[PDB]
Each structure stands twice: as C-alpha cells, then as structure tokens.
Design an enzyme around this catalytic site. Structure first.
Site, mmCIF file in Angstrom:
data_model
loop_
_atom_site.group_PDB
_atom_site.id
_atom_site.type_symbol
_atom_site.label_atom_id
_atom_site.label_comp_id
_atom_site.label_asym_id
_atom_site.label_seq_id
_atom_site.Cartn_x
_atom_site.Cartn_y
_atom_site.Cartn_z
ATOM 1 N N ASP A 35 -11.959 -18.621 -33.489
ATOM 2 C CA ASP A 35 -12.036 -20.036 -33.121
ATOM 3 C C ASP A 35 -10.962 -20.823 -33.860
ATOM 4 O OD1 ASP A 35 -12.716 -22.560 -32.336
ATOM 5 O OD2 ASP A 35 -14.613 -22.648 -33.471
ATOM 6 N N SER A 199 1.533 -32.405 -25.941
ATOM 7 C CA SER A 199 2.119 -31.951 -24.686
ATOM 8 C C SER A 199 2.993 -33.050 -24.105
ATOM 9 C CB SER A 199 1.013 -31.588 -23.686
ATOM 10 O OG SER A 199 1.540 -31.280 -22.409
#
Length: 330
Positions: A35, A199
């Site tokens: 994770d 992004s």
C-alpha cells in the site's frame, strides 16, 4: 541488495493485489497488500480477536525465534474506506522477494474491522508511503522500504501491476525490460506523507487532451481512480446510459457498453488506460448495471491514482533524498 516479488490480484476484478512476505524465523509467509498510501506493516496474528479471523493466515510471534515484543508500543489506523485495525508491535525479520530487513516493526492486530475479516485473501498490509504516517506510538516506526533503503543498490521501488494478471514489485533496481519507451519523472511532495504529484491533464477516448493540473497520490492500496467531479463527468458523458447513483455510491453504466479509454498526463508524456480497465462488473450478481472504475474524489479530499491508473504504467517510486515518481508505458 535487491528484491523482486510477484503480486497477484485477489479476485477477477483486480480489487486488490497480494504479495507474499516472509516474517520471522523459521519463515511465516503471509500475503500482504502492498500500500503506497499508508505506512504501517500490520498482520493478522495469534493475538487477533478470534471472531475477527475468517480464513486469513496469521503471524504467531511466539513461534519466531527472532521476534521481540516492542515493549509499550501500540498502533491504530483508519483507512480512506472506513476500515481500521489496531494492536501491539513486535520487531522481527521480514523478507520480500529475497530482500531482508532485520528489526522491522511488525504490527500485530488485536482488532480488525469487518471488511478485513470478510476478505480471507489479505493477511495484512505492507505500507510504502512515507514513514511520517506510521501510527506506532509512542515511538514511530519506519516502513520496510525506509529500513531497506540504505542497503539497496538504488533507493527505489517499482510497481508493475497487471490487468487481470499478476505483476511485480521490485526493490533496489529498475527493470529496463519491463516497460516501453522512456520513463518520465515528475516531482513529488511529501508534505502529507504520500507519493503526491501533479498530473498535467487528461483525455477521454480519442478526444483532445485537456491541459490542467491534477494533484493526487500514487496509491497502490486503492482500487479505483478518483478524480475531480468535472473530469469524471466528462468521462462518463461519453458512455450512453452512464449515471451517478447515490444508492450504489458512484457512477454505474450499462454492462452492454464499450468503455472509452482514459489518458492522463505525466509531464509531456501520456499514460493510456484502456476502457476495459475501467469495468468493475455488475453491481450485484446478475445485474445489468456495472460499476465504473473512474469515480469522483469530491468526498475524499484528495485525488487518488489507484490501481486502475497505476496498472496501465510501469511506476518508479524514487526515494532519493528528493523523492520523485516515474511513469512509463508498458
């Protein structure tokens, strides 16, 4: 040193991925959920409330000659999905794919919430976010990656998740055969303890690319792709009959649909998520309503590049003094 381990979907939808981890002496192998959005290594164990164990493999520290109680230490964690677990702490030897850490904090669960009990395939979690998120008190503990870093050939790990297929986690090296083209690296903020990056935009199917900054986290422990509601609406508008259902809890679409791809930007580069990766199947057995793999982050507080996005790429988690993320097509 290096390590290399195969990671395997837990089910036919890629709801999560499990990676075998050796703990203790002699080894006890547990299948853990790696994770990159949390920082605790915790396991079902001989200490877990018996009614909360239903098929998991447990760690029994009393059978490990290298286990030592970390006296006084406790841990307690709640995840973005409302699940939680808590317990006490041992140190022990932990190996992943041939890479060994001695003195790793292994957090032994005394209690786990129902979603963990109900998932017999996940024996615990191995956190790979930054150690500042680790929940051990009163002495915070380091992640497996942080403990291994100094010994690694290069202070990196890579995630290469499969679509409906196994993939690989590598530690200490970049497999140049695992990806196509070049790796595009992008800046990371550690201020929230996550692998947080920005992004450069998105496209829906064959549509034109929209240049817009989207801050989010690279999170292998989250199944889906969670993005701003504007972006998600633009995607699902291209699927006839798709709609957001409050009763289901997200966007659903007719199972008869063919889904468009979704592209996200990494600097000047582009990662394409095929439409099939966005199909998470009938909402209930036999239903003709299917659950979407791109959902709104509006209720979370952060955008999440989860497995749906990461499995379309070869992803480098660079833990150099100034951390960065790298994305390649594959």
């Amino acid at each position: 040193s290096t390590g290399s381990a195969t990671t395997t979907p837990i089910d036919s939808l890629d709801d999560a991925y499990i990676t075998p981890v050796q703990i203790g002496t002699p080894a006890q192998t547990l299948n853990l959920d790696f994770d990159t959005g949390s920082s605790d290594l915790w396991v079902f164990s001989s200490e877990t409330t018996a009614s909360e164990v239903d098929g998991q493999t447990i760690y029994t520290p009393s059978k490990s000659t290298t286990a030592k109680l970390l006296s006084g230490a406790t841990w307690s964690i709640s995840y973005g999905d409302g699940s939680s677990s808590s317990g006490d702490v041992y140190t022990d030897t932990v190996s992943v794919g041939g890479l060994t850490v001695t003195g790793q904090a292994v957090e032994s669960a005394k209690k786990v919430s129902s979603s963990f009990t109900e998932d017999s395939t996940i024996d615990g979690l191995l956190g790979l976010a930054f150690s500042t998120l680790n929940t051990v008190s009163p002495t915070q503990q380091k992640t497996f990656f942080d403990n291994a870093k100094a010994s690694l050939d290069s202070p990196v790990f890579t995630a290469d998740l499969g679509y409906h297929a196994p993939g690989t986690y590598n530690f200490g090296f970049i497999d140049t055969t695992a990806y196509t083209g070049s790796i595009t690296y992008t800046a990371v903020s550690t201020k929230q303890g996550f692998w947080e990056w920005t992004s450069t935009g998105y496209a829906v199917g064959s549509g034109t690319f929209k240049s817009t900054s989207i801050d989010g986290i690279a999170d292998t422990g989250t199944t889906l792709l969670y993005l701003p509601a504007t972006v998600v609406s633009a995607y699902w508008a291209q699927v006839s009959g798709a709609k957001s259902s409050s009763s289901v809890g997200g966007y659903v679409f007719p199972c008869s649909a063919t889904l468009p791809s979704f592209t996200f930007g990494v600097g000047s580069a582009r990662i394409v998520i095929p439409g099939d990766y966005i199909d998470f199947g009938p909402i209930s057995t036999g239903s003709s309503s299917c659950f979407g793999g791109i959902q709104s982050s509006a209720g979370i507080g952060i955008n999440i590049f989860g497995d749906v996005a990461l499995k379309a790429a070869f992803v480098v988690f660079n833990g150099a003094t100034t951390p960065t993320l790298g994305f390649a097509s594959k």
